[PDB]
Amino acid sequence: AQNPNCNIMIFHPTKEEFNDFDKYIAYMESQGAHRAGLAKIIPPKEWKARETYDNISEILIATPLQQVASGRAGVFTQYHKKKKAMTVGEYRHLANSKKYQTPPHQNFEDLERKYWKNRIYNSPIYGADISGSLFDENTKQWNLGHLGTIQDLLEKECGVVIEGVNTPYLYFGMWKTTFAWHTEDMDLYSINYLHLGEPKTWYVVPPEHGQRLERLARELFPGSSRGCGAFLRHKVALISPTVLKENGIPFNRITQEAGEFMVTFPYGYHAGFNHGFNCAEAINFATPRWIDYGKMASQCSCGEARVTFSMDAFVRILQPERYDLWKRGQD
């Protein structure tokens, strides 16, 4: 069995290997990459996403979100307070202000210590889930707006034609902006490209151990767990690496830098934080191996998780017994 310790693997495809996206994902899985729940892909030196980032300031962040924490430093939730619209140029100036800017630090490990010590005491502002793309239309390799759609994958594997579309999303971050512990909708893959700016640190639980994370989360968030049997779908709970180690939960960590891709694999729980002003692009995707995970994915029916249009068909076709209850949660 390849990668039996579930370590995060780092890949360096050549330009020739970077042509065929599906083939390279299957190659990484042949080497055991999915066992980690997360992999890093460094593009060949010949490749670029676009020519420059000099003309992005006028993109609008219609609903910036202030991430307000409650709890203790290592075990907290966050809620998202909506703020007034601002441009990417206005948000970058805000991220660089004395109130929000990255503090002085020695290295990524010192910054990680500072994040976990101090995050709860601040409320950083995140631009999230902004439909759009920063890949040039002429970038043919690993262009996250040109991937095969999940609807087409389901049709190819299962024969059933369904409604829905699959487009990318932009994220604009600042110091301490936080992504809570979650798997993807319908336990899909994700791919994330860090276009510019400061790093993103990730934490991940191997898919084979995801239920250990869920059992800890029920213990640490006992009111939320009574409210919903899949409350991590709400994307609000944070648990620090120190708390995970104290409780014996298997996990790994890695820092993504600008110019690098990360892939999350089906049922790989992940969480993380941004080091300073940055911009990322991400989309969900599927492969043949996903279908069995989609059939088994938990679902939130309490009303909190509220998701895209295109999840309807995935539940309807893969999980017909759960469909009626889940849809009641959507309405």
Ligand X SMILES: O=C(O)CNC(=O)C(=O)O
DSSP secondary structure of 47-75: --S-S-STT-TT-EESS-EEEEEEEETTE
Nearer to ligand X, 195 or 212 (CB): 195
- Name which of 129 and 324 has its Cβ closer to ligand X: 129
User: Is residue 280 involved in binding ligand X (CB under 6 A)?
Assistant: yes
**Site map 290..309 versus Zn ion, x via CB under 5 A:** ----------x-x-x-----
Judged by beta carbon, residue 104 or residue 176, the one nearer ligand X is 176
Asked if 60 touches Zn ion (CB under 5 A), the answer is no
Report how many residues bind Zn ion under the rule CB under 5 A.
4
**From the CB of 130, what's the least distance to Mg ion, in Å?**
12
Q: What is the CA radius of gyration of the chain?
A: 19
CB of 93 to Zn ion, least distance (A): 37
Contact (Cβ atoms closer than 8 angstroms) between residue 246 and residue 173: no
Whole-angstrom CA distances from 326 to 90, 175, 231 are: 39, 36, 14
Answer whether 322's CB lies under 8 Å from 315's CB.
Answer: yes
- Residues annotated in a binding site for Zn(2+): 228, 234, 300, 302
Which of 92/234 has CB closer to Zn ion?
234
Binding-site annotation: residue ranges for Fe cation: 182, 184, 270
Burial class from Cβ neighbours inside 10 Å (0-12, 13-18, 19+) for residue 213 reads buried
Q: Does 58 bind Mg ion (CB under 5 A)?
A: yes
Q: Which one of residues 76, 91, 100, 179 is an interface residue with ligand X (CB under 6 A)? A: 179
Q: CA-CA distance, 18 to 21, in Å (whole number)?
A: 7
**Residue type, position 163, single letter:** E
Neighbours of 88 (CB within 10 A): 20
Binding site for Mg ion (CB under 5 A): 56, 58-59
Contact positions vs ligand X (CB under 6 A): 171, 179, 190, 192, 200, 264, 280, 282
